[PDB]
Ligand binder design. Structure first.
Ligand SMILES: COc1nn(C)cc1C(=O)N[S@@]1(=O)=NC(=O)c2ccc3c(c2)N(C[C@@H]2CCO[C@H]2[C@@](CN2CCN4CCOC[C@@H]4C2)(OC)/C(F)=C/C[C@H](C)C1)C[C@@]1(CCCc2cc(Cl)ccc21)CO3
Ligand SMILES: OC[C@H]1O[C@H](O[C@H]2[C@H](O)[C@@H](O)[C@@H](O)O[C@@H]2CO)[C@H](O)[C@@H](O)[C@@H]1O
Length: 518
């Protein structure tokens, strides 16, 4: 479809101040005659990449910054180019959250971190440790109350505990992420998640508790504590619960480490209203009055706009938010975050329900989180060595035995496919007529159509990759060697995105090696 000209459609999550945002839209309309429509669809962060890929969707999308690198990598976002005067009005670390491959890809709005929220009438002093919560629940159950209820369906809420004793997503050292170094199934992560599962086993929490259940229980005074962000404070105010916002409990003497989000506003690359969107965001929303309108609906947290943040920073709930933020870590925005989150969401749900043990659940989450990088390493190396006739001497890195053995297996079975199907490979190569970087970009839809819609097995995966190597050899011959790495990335994307669940079920590339073991 085509995004309509002369209006703005905005998407924002249903937990945020969308009525306040609509009020800013009405002010925009008053000046310009342009109607602003604010919507809060379910699963908007999943919807957006689907609809935007076809040139459809909202003009402006709001989400935490972690999803935006994926959207940008997919060509779904307009580059943001504010002048120095405007840039200097927001905190530099907030612009850093929305920078991807050296370009600004959204406007930052506000810094979000989870805090412990407690009912002062039930618990005059909140617990400093996770370890004391079982005893406190036992005390409270004798009064017809519980200690703690929070959303167990979204890993954002359980991550602070998983991270506390050493769980991590992608290792960060010397100002750099090692995307090859994933910390989901280490001893620290296991300790955190085992503690959560034990809370459930011992009937201190219920695996089925979700956002709405926890919110209602806290706001009705049935549970003494919850874990939530600034957006939740409005409904708690309405409830008249005597609440405090404080630092999350420690685990094994170490701080809980929330993953810190920057609510951000991106502009759809397919929007014909980009100048209207820029005007709205810079001169209506990111002003004291614009942020106030949203904040009075549902609190934003620590806003990116220095002038308004100076007012808000006096609020002890914001101080608490920022204390927790400083103990946590800013989320990456790398495209791999979506997969990391899906993998950890499934692990927590399965461990909490008893569908899998903690060890089983975190193993699968490690494999899912490593899948893209490991797949790319194997596929890129095979294509490149096939094209040039010489292997890559660089170390395989993390899970290197698997990568090496997968590459050796792929050499055996993939060369066999190419050899036996040479005429068919030649025919398809000529039919596809691949000449340059632009023609390579067209192959994804063809790969999805042919590969992803057929039967899922290792044989057809070998064919996918083997035909890729055949194409790579051709590209080298015609002085298009620079196209090979983009080709490898494209094949990897199709494989891992469309066969994610199947691949994890096979133990990823270890399953491949096992399947073709001679
Ligand atoms: C015991 O059995 C086996 N052991 N082992 C080890 C393998 C098998 C086995 O049987 N495998 S098999 O079932 N696999 C497939 O069929 C298959 C799987 C994935 C594919 C993939 C195909 N394709 C079409 C092929 C390529 C050459 O001619 C093709 C084919 C079959 N195709 C199927 C789709 N139709 C659509 C209409 O036009 C004709 C076309 C024909 O042609 C005969 C072929 F060679 C199949 C042989 C496979 C080995 C059979 C390539 C593809 C689409 C093109 C773009 C593009 C680009 C890159 Cl970079 C990379 C890939 C692609 C997607 O990836
Ligand atoms: O649970 C995984 C989920 O976490 C974060 O989403 C948060 C969001 O940042 C908050 O603003 C609020 O809406 O709660 C969400 C959790 O339900 C990530 O931003 C998101 O990408 C991820 O899927």
């Amino acid at each position: 479809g085509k995004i309509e000209e002369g209006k703005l459609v905005i998407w924002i999550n249903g937990d945020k101040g969308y009525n306040g945002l609509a009020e800013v839209g009405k002010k925009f309309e008053k000046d310009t005659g342009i109607k602003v429509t604010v919507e809060h669809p379910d699963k908007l962060e999943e919807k957006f990449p689907q609809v935007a890929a076809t040139g459809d969707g909202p003009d402006i999308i709001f989400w935490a910054h972690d999803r935006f690198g994926g959207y940008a990598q997919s060509g779904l976002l307009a580059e943001i180019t504010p002048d120095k005067a405007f840039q200097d009005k927001l905190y530099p670390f907030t612009w850093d959250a929305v920078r991807y491959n050296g370009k600004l890809i959204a406007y930052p709005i506000a810094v979000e971190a989870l805090s412990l929220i407690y009912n002062k009438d039930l618990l005059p002093n909140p617990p400093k440790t996770w370890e004391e919560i079982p005893a406190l629940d036992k005390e409270l159950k004798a009064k017809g109350k519980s200690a703690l209820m929070f959303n167990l369906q979204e890993p954002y809420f359980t991550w602070p505990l998983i991270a506390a004793d050493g769980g991590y997503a992608f290792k960060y050292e010397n100002g750099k992420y090692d995307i090859k170094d994933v910390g989901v199934d280490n001893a620290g992560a296991k300790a955190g998640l085992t503690f959560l599962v034990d809370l459930i086993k011992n009937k201190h929490m219920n695996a089925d508790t979700d956002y709405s259940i926890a919110e209602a229980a806290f706001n009705k005074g049935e549970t003494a504590m919850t874990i939530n962000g600034p957006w939740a404070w409005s409904n708690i105010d309405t409830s008249k619960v005597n609440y405090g916002v404080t630092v999350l409990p420690t685990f094994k003497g170490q701080p809980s480490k929330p993953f810190v989000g920057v609510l951000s506003a991106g502009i759809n690359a397919a929007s014909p209203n980009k100048e209207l969107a820029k005007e709205f965001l810079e001169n209506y929303l990111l002003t004291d009055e614009g942020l106030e309108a949203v904040n009075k609906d549902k609190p934003l947290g620590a806003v990116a706009l220095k002038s308004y943040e100076e007012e808000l920073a006096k609020d002890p709930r914001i101080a608490a938010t920022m204390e927790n933020a400083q103990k946590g870590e800013i989320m990456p925005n790398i495209p791999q975050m979506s997969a990391f989150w899906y993998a950890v969401r499934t692990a927590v749900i399965n461990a909490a329900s008893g569908r899998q043990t903690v060890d089983e659940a975190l193993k699968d989450a490690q494999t899912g989180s490593e899948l893209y990088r490991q797949s790319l390493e194997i596929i890129s190396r095979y294509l490149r060595e096939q094209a040039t006739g010489a292997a890559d001497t660089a170390p395989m890195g993390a899970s290197g035995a698997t990568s090496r053995k997968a590459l050796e297996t792929l050499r055996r079975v993939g060369d066999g496919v190419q050899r036996n199907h040479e005429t068919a490979f030649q025919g398809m190569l000529r039919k596809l007529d691949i000449k340059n970087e632009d023609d390579v970009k067209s192959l994804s839809r063809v790969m999805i159509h042919v590969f992803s819609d057929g039967v899922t097995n290792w044989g057809r995966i070998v064919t996918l990759i083997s035909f890729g190597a055949f194409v790579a050899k051709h590209l080298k011959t015609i002085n298009q060697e620079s196209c090979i790495e983009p080709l490898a990335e494209s094949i990897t994307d199709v494989l891992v995105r469309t066969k994610r669940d199947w691949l994890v079920k096979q133990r990823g590339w270890d399953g491949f090696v096992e399947f073709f073991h001679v």
